Amino acid sequence: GGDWQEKRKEAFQLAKEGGIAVALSMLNDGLVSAVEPRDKFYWRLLSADLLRANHLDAMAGEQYQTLLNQVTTLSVPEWEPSLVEQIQRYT
Amino acid sequence: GGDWQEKRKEAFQLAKEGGIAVALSMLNDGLVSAVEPRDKFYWRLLSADLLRANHLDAMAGEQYQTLLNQVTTLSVPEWEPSLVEQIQRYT
């Protein structure tokens, strides 16, 4: 994913060796930046992936499953299906 | 739109002063490139905008309205609503 992966590894390596919390501090500064429900999704998704990296599996498991159901409501399965397919992989 | 606008002025100015048809020649080379229905949309959209620029309003009017109905099927109104809102402006 283009902007997905541009911010993904950016806040990943900001915290993988930098501070875990300094990344999440600006993550909501980037998600408060988001203006659409399309935009308000990926930030929380990649935060799930973030906290997944730190071996915090089930804190954000709920964030995976709660959004796996927040998406099937609105036909994204025929409109970017992969996006939720890897969610289906990691819920 | 990021990739939308990256290719929008890319084939706009390829034809605005260059050849009108050389742009559309590679447009389907870019849309045959498209992998998903999400991807298969924007190319035909911007082709509508292309042929709109050349004062060919109603040839592609049908391409506007036929896709305005091909989208409401799948909940994009709560998932990138603007995208189809400007379609609503130009159908």
Numbering used by the authors:
A (entry chain A), B (entry chain B): 1 to 91
Can I see the authors' text?
The type VI secretion system (T6SS) is a membrane‐anchored contractile nanomachine used by many Gram‐negative bacteria to deliver proteins from the cytosol directly to an extracellular space or across a target cell membrane. All TssA‐like proteins harbor a conserved ImpA_N domain (PF06812) located at the N‐terminal end, while the C‐terminal part differs in its composition. The Vibrio cholerae and P. aeruginosa TssA proteins TssAVC and TssA2PA with C‐terminal VasJ domain (Class A) facilitate sheath assembly initiation and polymerization by forming a stable dodecamer at the end of the sheath that is distal from the membrane anchor. Therefore, while potentially not being strictly essential, Class A TssAs act as chaperones assisting sheath‐tube copolymerization, which likely requires assistance in proper formation of the sheath hand‐shake domain (Ge et al, 2015; Kudryashev et al, 2015; Wang et al, 2017).
To further analyze the TssA of V. cholerae, we purified the protein and used cryo‐electron microscopy (cryo‐EM) to solve its structure. To test the symmetry, an initial 3D reference was built and refined without imposing any symmetry (C1), which resulted in clear six‐pointed star reconstruction. Further refinements have been done utilizing C6 symmetry. The outer and lumenal diameters are 132 and 53 Å, and the height of the assembly is 38 Å. Molecular weight estimation from the size‐exclusion chromatography (SEC) profile is ~600 kDa, which corresponds to twelve copies of TssAVC in one oligomer (634 kDa from sequence). The model built in cryo‐EM density of TssAVC is composed of twelve C‐terminal subunits (G376‐T466, helices α8–α12) tightly packed as two interpenetrating rings, similar to A. hydrophila TssA (TssAAH), but different from head‐to‐head stacked hexameric rings of the TssAEC assembly (Zoued et al, 2016; Dix et al, 2018). Each of the C‐terminal subunits forms two interfaces with its neighbors. The first 688 Å2 PISA‐predicted interface is based on three conserved residues (W454, E455, and P456) from α11–α12 linker of one subunit and helix α10 from the neighboring subunit. Second 672 Å2 interface forms a sixfold axis between helices α9–α11 of two neighboring subunits. Our reconstruction of TssAVC CTD fits as a rigid body with CC = 0.87 into the distal end of VipA‐N3 sheath mutant reconstruction.
